[PDB]
Design a binder for this molecule. Sequence first.
Ligand SMILES: C[NH+](C)c1cc(NC(=O)CNC(C)(C)C)c(O)c2c1C[C@H]1C[C@H]3[C@H]([NH+](C)C)C(O)=C(C(N)=O)C(=O)[C@@]3(O)C(O)=C1C2=O
Ligand SMILES: C[NH+](C)c1cc(NC(=O)CNC(C)(C)C)c(O)c2c1C[C@H]1C[C@H]3[C@H]([NH+](C)C)C(O)=C(C(N)=O)C(=O)[C@@]3(O)C(O)=C1C2=O
Ligand SMILES: [Cl-]
Ligand SMILES: [Cl-]
Ligand SMILES: [Cl-]
Ligand SMILES: [Cl-]
Ligand SMILES: [Cl-]
Ligand SMILES: [Cl-]
Ligand SMILES: [Mg+2]
Ligand SMILES: [Mg+2]
Lengths: 195, 195
Amino acid sequence: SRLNRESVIDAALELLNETGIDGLTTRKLAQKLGIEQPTLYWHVKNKRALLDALAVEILARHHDYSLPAAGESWQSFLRNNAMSFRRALLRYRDGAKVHLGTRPDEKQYDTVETQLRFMTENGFSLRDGLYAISAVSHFTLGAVLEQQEHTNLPPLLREALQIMDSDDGEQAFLHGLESLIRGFEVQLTALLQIV
Amino acid sequence: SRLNRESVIDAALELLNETGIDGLTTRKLAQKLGIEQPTLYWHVKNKRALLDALAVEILARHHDYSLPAAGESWQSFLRNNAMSFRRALLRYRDGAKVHLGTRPDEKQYDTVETQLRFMTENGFSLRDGLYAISAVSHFTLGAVLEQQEHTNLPPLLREALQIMDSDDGEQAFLHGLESLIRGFEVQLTALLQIV
Ligand SMILES: C[NH+](C)c1cc(NC(=O)CNC(C)(C)C)c(O)c2c1C[C@H]1C[C@H]3[C@H]([NH+](C)C)C(O)=C(C(N)=O)C(=O)[C@@]3(O)C(O)=C1C2=O
Ligand SMILES: C[NH+](C)c1cc(NC(=O)CNC(C)(C)C)c(O)c2c1C[C@H]1C[C@H]3[C@H]([NH+](C)C)C(O)=C(C(N)=O)C(=O)[C@@]3(O)C(O)=C1C2=O
Ligand SMILES: [Cl-]
Ligand SMILES: [Cl-]
Ligand SMILES: [Cl-]
Ligand SMILES: [Cl-]
Ligand SMILES: [Cl-]
Ligand SMILES: [Cl-]
Ligand SMILES: [Mg+2]
Ligand SMILES: [Mg+2]
């Protein structure tokens, strides 16, 4: 079939949904594309470089709230951005494991910069804004990893596992997110007081 | 060498530090123990069951703040428990990836129950206490995963990557933790007011 960048990524995401990250190989990617392994090698050198590219394209295709709206609060932006990040990660099998370990790509340089300058325009230091941005990322990735990778009790534990089951963990994620944003807001409003 | 449970786990953690999770196999475990693969098979059926056991023993050996001290605040307990969880996860190469996906073991039933009852004794609903406990776990695992799995910039991004480098991410982790606990405390003190 066609082996432009877009078709190779399309095939690899479709294979990812079929096999998961551990089972995704260049050999099964060559099979799905109806080509020999050395043909594929011209286009994609190894599994490392494939996963790096998926990680970037899944966010390019499906993370539609990278940027704040005109006049949006920093609280509302972090909320929307976290929900968008979570959705994009959940959209493919093992999607969070695909994202894990990746550093911003040159193609998202300007996005991450904008996020950080935006927080600095709203009264954060670069440091405090970085802390807030990393805490949202680390909380969101952790939540989606346990959700995806989870794919004679004592009473509380029994009832709790029941509660976590009754939805995907969207409730626990959205509640924790509100707690993190409020804690950031309490820190920011304090200035130099003891808080 | 000796193949009691304790010696097999000792060998497997030492191999884990050598190879990482992806490179850890029952074949290299048999080699390190100076045995044949079918001998090992009697003791440990597969990689799945090995990793499940490591995940539990790393916390049994090295997570020493599973439980609150006599008279400890819920805020102080969650802080200490998060730092202890983080330390235990960092202690082995890919330790967070080993933990990821695991459900409490029967051997830790009574620990997780105690944590949840403790939060309920301090004014949380079972639900709100579960949310707080899962938010700490998801935030801690996310932070340690990016730390472990990370193993012509625009200005803010350049300076920020510099800041995250200057330590392991202990600063960003401890700051985010304070934000999460304060957000939980604001939620809890609100009762039925609009907050
Ligand atoms: C915070 N900046 C400086 C940054 C740093 C690193 N890497 C490190 O900290 C590396 N850590 C060492 C220094 C090696 C220990 C980072 O790894 C990241 C990021 C940025 C985030 C931005 C994330 C953001 N959302 C979820 C808060 C976002 O929406 C985007 C986006 N493309 O639209 C992201 O790319 C983001 O999800 C993301 O993945 C980030 C990083 O990975
Ligand atoms: C919250 N309880 C109900 C619970 C549930 C799950 N599993 C799920 O939620 C499964 N999710 C589905 C329902 C499949 C989508 C859980 O997976 C967990 C836990 C408990 C935590 C307890 C963690 C705790 N610290 C870090 C807050 C802790 O110190 C211990 C300990 N042994 O001392 C833990 O075991 C803990 O780190 C941990 O791993 C938990 C869970 O994994
Ligand atoms: Cl072509
Ligand atoms: Cl293309
Ligand atoms: Cl707003
Ligand atoms: Cl023996
Ligand atoms: Cl033993
Ligand atoms: Cl205390
Ligand atoms: Mg990332
Ligand atoms: Mg766990």
